Design a protein around this ligand. Structure first.
Ligand SMILES: [Mg+2]
Ligand SMILES: [Mg+2]
Ligand SMILES: [Mg+2]
Ligand SMILES: [Mg+2]
Ligand SMILES: [Mg+2]
Ligand SMILES: [Mg+2]
Ligand SMILES: [Mg+2]
Ligand SMILES: [Mg+2]
Ligand SMILES: [Mg+2]
Ligand SMILES: [Mg+2]
Ligand SMILES: [Mg+2]
Ligand SMILES: [Mg+2]
Ligand SMILES: [Mg+2]
Ligand SMILES: [Mg+2]
Ligand SMILES: [Mg+2]
Ligand SMILES: [Mg+2]
Ligand SMILES: [Mg+2]
Ligand SMILES: [Mg+2]
Ligand SMILES: [Mg+2]
Ligand SMILES: [Mg+2]
Ligand SMILES: [Mg+2]
Ligand SMILES: [Mg+2]
Ligand SMILES: [Mg+2]
Lengths: 188, 260, 142, 167, 124
RNA sequence: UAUCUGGUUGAUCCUGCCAGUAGUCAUAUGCUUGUCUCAAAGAUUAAGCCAUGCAUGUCUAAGUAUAAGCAAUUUAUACAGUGAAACUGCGAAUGGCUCAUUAAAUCAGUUAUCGUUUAUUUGAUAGUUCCUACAUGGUAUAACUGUGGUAAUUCUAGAGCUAAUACAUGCUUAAAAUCUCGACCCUUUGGAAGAGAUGUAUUUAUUAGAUAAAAAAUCAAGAUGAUUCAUAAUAACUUUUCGAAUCGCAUGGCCUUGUGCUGGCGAUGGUUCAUUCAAAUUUCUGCCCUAUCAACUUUCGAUGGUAGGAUAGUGGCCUACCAUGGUUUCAACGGGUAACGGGGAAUAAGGGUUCGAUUCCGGAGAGGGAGCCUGAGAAACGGCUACCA
RNA sequence: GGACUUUUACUUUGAAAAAAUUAGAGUGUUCAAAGCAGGCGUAUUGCUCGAAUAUAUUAGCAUGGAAUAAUAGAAUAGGACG
RNA sequence: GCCCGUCGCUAGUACCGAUUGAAUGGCUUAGUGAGGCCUCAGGAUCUGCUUAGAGAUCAGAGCGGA
């Protein structure tokens, strides 16, 4: 199949190589998963030495962590926004690592306002306790809140869907979301 | 070359088995096991070529399938089983006890030991790590992992092993001036107590040894098996106590012991 | 040089987290290390803003194997250089030597400022690129 | 002599790639596939033999078919399939509900009933008790070592705070 | 795939093909001890040419050199053993001279006749 | 083991080559052939072609026996001995054969993995699974019986049976600690019953993993030469990995007399970690002849950077986007080789010269090319698929 | 353990280094090429030496040496020293 | 005495040379493309989960599996 060996591929001097031996199972390579959005479909790739790896195509949900908040909430993945590699992966909404998405926000608003009693944007006993205990804490961020107003959060996949079998990411925060917002209205 | 090689050709077998050129094509391949291929003595090599109990290999199997043999206490029927340094081979009829320990010539000598001394052995700690669930472990040269080690045991140290159960009964740290048994290099078979060590960050520390005649020689840290205290070995050394006589001295002793 | 973030991806050190909720003045929390072998991680590696995952200090790349020396003959390639390693080879017939040489590709951290003719020290690495197996650990000249 | 294969449609023959667990092919080897010639699933003049199974019996007896009846060769082996054949449930203790087949030595007429695997015996109970036993035996032996090392670690600290009290 | 069973050849043949002096000499030696072969002359003269090289090789080495001593003494006591070297002359400087007939005299063809028992080298 | 001799002239001394001489693990052939031991052998040319046969199969007390098999000791009335066939498991990735290719390739010596996979072997390693069969849960086949096709093969069709360590499911266990929730009460400085969650593996974020020499004010509440290492903690994630529905021998305590709670030896499994057999890339230096090969490389990856895809994993391996770089008279690049490389062989003053298809190691291949199934491992050929011959 | 250190060539010793083959010790294969065996007694209950050693270079690694040969240095003094 | 070159006879080796000469061995542009693999779909048949009915396994309906 595909081969990753360097036997081809001229030596650094510029020298074309002849061909010794053949292609080999262990130099092998396989086709991209090129995973898309919605309707989870996963195929088990059998790799070297047993070793299932998971080929994800069509994945609608992912486990996304709020880094600064120390929690991870399973959300929908609404669509792809930016990719540094290939513009087309945005346009087709293909799920990769380093890919910039927009997720859900809704389980993040249902934890945030149950935790802090705050209600982003715009009566029990022990609840009121911790609610007071948590303050000068819930400041959030200028650019984390305003996203909750359109109810979709910028995330960047840190995982490898075509390998692992999951599309997982973190919420673009501080500097990153400051960077990636620039290219977002410097492209739009 | 598409897989593991399951064969061995005579003349590729390591020289220390002392196998003869003719009289068959191949030498036995040692099983994967406690000890590496090049340092080991398979049980057909020992039961036949050394102990001369078995003529063929077919009698080596007639022996090993009746459980007449055991190694480090366990019966161990594999015709190629890779016995190794510090193992104790025990035959319950004939009531014999052997530990595998090096010659001065670098080879494996048949060394008879006490019904009692047989019951323990020495490993050298190859590594000691913090395992899963926080349980630390140490692992010997001979392939034993042992849970919950004494925390002063560090890498390269030897250990006394129970052999009835897995338990470490004792250890000797690696220090300047501790009786040592070289396993490796040409110096294989010597004894002699560790002058001191060269560091060489970047790999390969060097260990200066002086045996009991005040002769000096060096190896790399890899080959240095700590066996005891000056005098004071923890096992029964074979005759010659690894001093390495010159060819001259060896000619003399042999011809000095002469008259019929 | 300059521009920090000028690439299409956000350049960041992996798993190096500054919470935004907790106000700080550095504005970047930075991880580095020491290569060892008596190789001092220079100030420019701990005071810098550069990312370079391939830097032996601020990066992921682990220095092991040979440690070589040679003089810098090409700085063109950004964040990498080529050094001509002169050596003498022995011809047993004529019992003399002859001038042979090799060029070695090596990745120089922007942690260093190198010019052509400055001899350099270099040490072995996991394969970084097609050609480069070595990273620049010291500037030993000019 | 080429057989039909269900699902190929066509009133023709086509060569196909066959694998394990499929019709008109028995592999010789693990993972072996063999390209072979197969006949369509649609009936036509080119057929020598047509396989017919009867769904509904007709208004006249078919002599070789209906007038006769042929036995099933083997009876239930496993415990619960005997109980589902004979309507027992879990009390009924098969053992006597098992088929017996007589066969003759010619003056010595014999009987042979199969065997069972997966049935519940005193043996199988002793083994499950053995297993539950070793599992708790080791885990408590395991805490024994875990504490005993914890002892060795806190009594090494008190030789550390004592050596700190000597100087 | 078995062992090479190693071998070698016991003799050498003279550089100069036709030399009268040597042809007489060889004949005389072959008549004295009663051989059939210049080969049997060749063979021994090969035996010597190797002993003499070894001797010569031990002589360039320092006096009381472990090699010279260990092998020098070993060879000498070997030659004395079969009676090619004299008790008096064994320091290895007489093996460096020695000569061909010294070995010939020691043959069991020659010893059969040399003490009684035969009354010819051809009867031997 | 440091040697020369013959041949140019009338004669001479030189130059100089031809001839003579000896050895060859160097082939052929001619002639001749008694013994002992040893014993190379279709490499050379044609990795050119192939008739026939043989070369890979396998069972322990110990996964599956209703052979309508064979033994009958009558002692197994579930089965038992023996035991074809078949299933299941494991092997066929070793060996053997050959040297076509292959000239920075291979190979040698020396390094690297803080860059990976790894059956088996050896050492360890599992109380956490939800009224629910746990005295143990499903229907689904071979062999077989029988009915058939086709000139033809290790071709098989339709029908009827019946197993499992096959397939597919599916229970379970001590104490404790910590976490969020929180019904109430009550104002403090505040405290709470009781409800749930916490095996292991997978995925991601975040934190712990200290340690050049020292003291104060305020706002908020173990290891390494080196690592993001080992290991552990938090919040989640999962077409949820694993946590024994298996087997053989012995039958014993315990009796508040029952199939009654317990219980001996060891087989095969099982997850991770280590070990061992390996494997795959990799650092440094070293290859023959050749300028009637001087510039080479980036169609279309050339050299680098960023990111991703992929792989077991490093990596222009591959893809986007960006830069214009990389080799060279220290001979690059191209051509050639009757070129596999090394251990080694022959020739013996010394320095050399010539050879190594071939008994050992490394590599390459199975007519040529490419493709992949199985598996721990094959880009396998005494495996398949296709094309060319 | 902290902080820094001009670079090389040569040469010394050492380690790491398959067996076979080479050199070579030992041993009466009857000699010998070979082989790595064998040699000694209640030969009626075993006794025992061996199966060494050298070469193993060019490069890598570790060490002694500072001759010989290169290299660097402080002159618009931004030189050293504190 | 030596000795040169044409010319003459016979034999041999190479050379130039119309044939847009010819062959073997390897790379390759363009065009076409078997096959396996991955992937969008397909659904011969054969089950599942669920729900409602009747008698102590047969009308009818949803959401997924091979
Ligand atoms: Mg879009
Ligand atoms: Mg092979
Ligand atoms: Mg003449
Ligand atoms: Mg000549
Ligand atoms: Mg005879
Ligand atoms: Mg041939
Ligand atoms: Mg049986
Ligand atoms: Mg790149
Ligand atoms: Mg990358
Ligand atoms: Mg060739
Ligand atoms: Mg050659
Ligand atoms: Mg060769
Ligand atoms: Mg050839
Ligand atoms: Mg040969
Ligand atoms: Mg070979
Ligand atoms: Mg192959
Ligand atoms: Mg093939
Ligand atoms: Mg084959
Ligand atoms: Mg064949
Ligand atoms: Mg004799
Ligand atoms: Mg005797
Ligand atoms: Mg003319
Ligand atoms: Mg004429």
């Amino acid at each position: 199949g595909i081969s990753r060996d360097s036997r081809h591929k001229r030596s650094a001097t510029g020298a074309k190589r002849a061909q010794f031996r053949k292609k080999r199972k262990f130099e092998l390579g396989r086709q991209p998963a090129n995973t898309k959005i919605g309707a989870k479909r996963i195929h088990s790739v059998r790799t070297r030495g047993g070793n299932k790896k998971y080929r994800a195509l069509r994945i609608e949900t992912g486990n996304f962590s709020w880094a600064s908040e120390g929690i991870s909430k399973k959300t929908r993945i609404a669509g792809v926004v930016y990719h540094p590699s290939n513009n087309e992966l945005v346009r087709t909404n293909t799920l990769t690592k380093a890919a910039i998405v927009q997720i859900d926000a809704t389980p993040f608003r249902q934890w945030f306002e149950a935790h802090y009693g705050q209600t982003l944007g715009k009566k029990s006993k022990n609840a009121e306790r911790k609610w007071a205990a948590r303050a000068a804490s819930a400041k959030i961020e200028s650019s984390v809140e305003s996203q909750f107003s359109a109810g979709r959060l910028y995330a960047c996949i840190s995982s490898r869907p075509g390998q692992s079998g999951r599309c997982d990411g973190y919420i673009l925060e501080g500097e990153e979301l400051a960077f990636y917002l620039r290219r977002l209205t410097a492209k739009k | 070359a598409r897989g593991p090689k399951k064969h061995l050709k005579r003349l590729a077998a390591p020289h220390h088995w002392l196998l003869d050129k003719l009289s068959g094509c191949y030498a036995p391949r040692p099983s994967a096991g406690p000890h590496k291929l090049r340092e080991s003595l398979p049980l057909i090599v020992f039961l036949r070529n050394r102990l001369k109990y078995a003529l063929n290999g077919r009698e080596v199997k007639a022996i090993l399938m009746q459980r007449h043999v055991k190694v480090d206490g366990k019966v161990r029927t594999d015709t190629t089983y890779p016995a190794g340094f510090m193992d104790v081979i025990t035959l319950d009829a004939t009531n014999e006890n052997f530990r595998l320990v090096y010659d001065v010539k670098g080879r494996f000598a048949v060394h008879r030991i006490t019904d009692e001394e047989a019951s323990y052995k020495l490993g050298k700690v190859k590594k000691v790590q913090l395992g899963k669930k926080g349980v630390p472990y140490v692992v010997t040269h001979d392939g034993r992992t042992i849970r919950y080690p004494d925390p002063n045991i560090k890498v390269n140290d030897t250990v006394k092993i129970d052999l009835a159960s897995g338990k470490i009964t004792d250890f000797i740290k690696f220090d300047a001036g501790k009786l040592v048994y070289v396993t490796g290099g040409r110096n294989l078979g010597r004894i002699g107590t560790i002058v001191h060590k060269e560091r060489h960050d970047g790999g390969f520390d060097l260990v200066h040894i002086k045996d009991s005649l005040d002769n000096t020689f060096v190896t790399r840290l890899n080959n240095v098996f700590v066996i005891g205290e000056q005098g004071k070995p923890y096992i029964s050394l074979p005759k010659g106590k690894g001093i390495k006589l010159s060819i001259a001295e060896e000619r003399d002793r042999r011809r000095a012991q002469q008259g019929l | 040089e300059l521009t920090v973030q000028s690439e299409r991806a956000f350049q960041k050190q992996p798993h190096i987290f500054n919470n935004p909720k907790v106000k700080t003045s550095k504005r970047t929390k930075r991880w580095y290390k020491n290569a060892g072998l008596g190789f001092k991680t220079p100030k420019t590696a701990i005071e810098g803003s550069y990312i370079d995952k391939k830097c032996p200090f601020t990066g992921l790349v682990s220095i092991r194997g040979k440690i070589l020396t040679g003089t810098v003959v090409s700085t063109k390639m950004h964040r990498t250089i080529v050094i001509r390693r002169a050596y003498l080879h022995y011809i047993p017939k004529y019992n003399r030597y002859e001038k042979r040489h090799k060029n070695v590709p090596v990745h120089v951290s922007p942690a260093f400022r190198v010019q052509v003719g400055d001899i350099v020290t270099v040490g072995q690495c996991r394969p970084i690129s097609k050609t480069v197996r070595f990273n620049v650990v010291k500037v030993s000249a000019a | 002599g080429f057989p039909m294969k269900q699902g190929v449609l066509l009133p023709t023959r086509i060569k196909l790639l066959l694998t394990k667990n499929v019709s008109c092919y028995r592999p010789r080897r693990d993972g072996e596939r063999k390209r072979k010639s197969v006949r369509g699933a649609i009936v036509g003049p080119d057929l020598a033999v047509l396989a017919l199974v009867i769904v509904k019996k007709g208004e006249q007896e078919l002599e070789g078919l209906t007038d006769t009846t042929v036995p099933k060769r083997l009876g239930p082996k496993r415990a619960n399939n005997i109980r589902k054949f004979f309507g027992l449930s879990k009390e009924d203790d098969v053992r006597d509900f098992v088929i017996r087949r007589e066969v003759t030595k010619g003056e010595k007429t014999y009987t042979k009933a199969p065997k069972i695997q997966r049935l519940v015996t005193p043996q199988r109970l002793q083994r499950k008790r053995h297993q539950r036993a070793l599992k708790v035996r080791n885990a408590q032996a395991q805490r024994e070592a875990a504490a005993e090392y914890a002892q060795l670690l806190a009594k090494r600290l008190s030789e550390r705070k004592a050596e700190k009290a000597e100087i | 795939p078995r062992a090479p069973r190693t071998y070698s050849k016991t003799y050498s043949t003279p550089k100069r093909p036709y030399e009268s002096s040597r042809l007489d000499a060889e004949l005389k030696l072959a008549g004295e001890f009663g051989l059939k072969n210049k080969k049997e002359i060749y063979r021994i003269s090969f035996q010597l040419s190797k002993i003499r090289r070894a001797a010569r090789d031990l002589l360039t080495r320092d006096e009381k050199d472990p090699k010279r001593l260990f092998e020098g003494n070993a060879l000498i006591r070997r030659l004395v053993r079969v009676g090619v070297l004299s008790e008096d002359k064994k320091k290895l400087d007489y093996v460096l001279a020695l000569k061909v007939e010294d070995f010939l005299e020691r043959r069991l063809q020659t010893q059969v006749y040399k003490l009684g028992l035969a009354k010819s080298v051809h009867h031997a």
